[PDB]
């Protein structure tokens, strides 16, 4: 179901943002995320260390990589389109 793949996603891009090199990103944290209805967005809700502003900014500028990172583990015809929001945020 929904949850399992949201599980899956989660685990995923918290290492593919791991292994971006941006600053902005030191110690950021993913802490949850929650697909849309159709799978067609995945909203992503972090933690930053400082400047969250500017984490958001980082990961959204690398939403391209990070997705295209994504379609080489998870196994999804169209992998869902990145939202990046505050761990506030969250559902």
Do not use: C, N
Not at 47 to 62: H, K
């Amino acid at each position: 179901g929904k949850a399992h793949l949201e599980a899956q996603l989660k685990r995923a891009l918290a290492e593919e943002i791991q292994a971006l090199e941006d600053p902005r990103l030191f110690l950021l944290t993913v802490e949850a995320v929650r697909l849309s209805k159709d799978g067609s967005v995945l909203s992503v809700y972090v933690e930053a260390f400082r400047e969250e502003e500017g984490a958001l900014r980082a990961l959204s500028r690398a939403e391209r990589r990070l997705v295209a990172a994504l379609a080489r583990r998870v196994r999804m015809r169209r992998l869902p389109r990145l939202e990046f929001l505050p761990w506030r945020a969250s559902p």
